[model samples]
Target: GAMAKAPESATEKVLCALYAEILGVERVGVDDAFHDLGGSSALAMRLIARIREELGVDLPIRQLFSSPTPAGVARALAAKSASWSHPQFEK
Candidate 1:
């Protein structure tokens, strides 16, 4: 169980929900660690797919193993989106 760390953005909320669903948890905090919350390599792959399909951005599978938290995933998405020609949060 993790302390409550509410998501500050829509993307983060989506990620939190996705992680909760994948890990079969009631809810997920933004800073919650996936491994601590019952995550496995197989589950990580499924999460990577849903993220790409739902977020429309390719996330390296290693990212999950490296830092499996809502905030971590959000950071990766932000970095990827910012680097993309068409950013998700456009100016």
Candidate 2:
């Protein structure tokens, strides 16, 4: 049983809902760990796909392993979006 924490950001809210939907739960907290909520590789892939489809960001599977919560994923997504928007170019 994961503890519930209110999601503060739009990304966090969407991620929380996505996690709950993929895991077939009534709801999930912003801080709820994905694994703790019965997430497996199968479900993780589904979650990742939904995230990419809804958010237009490619979330690395390893990132999810390292930070397996809605808040953590939101931060990762923000980082990914930033990097994608501002790519480094060689001179």
For candidate 2, write residues 1-91 as lDDT tens digits: 5655655588898898889888889988887888888788778877889988887777878788877888898888878545355446999
lDDT of 1 by residue, 7-85 (tens): 5576778888888888887888887887878788788888888887787766777676666787788887778655456
**lDDT value for model 2:** 0.81
lDDT comparing candidate 1 with the true structure: 0.77
Backbone clash tally (model 2): 0
Whole-model Cα lDDT of every candidate shown, in order:
0.77, 0.81
Show model 1 residue runs off by greater than 4 Å. Answer: 4-7, 84-91
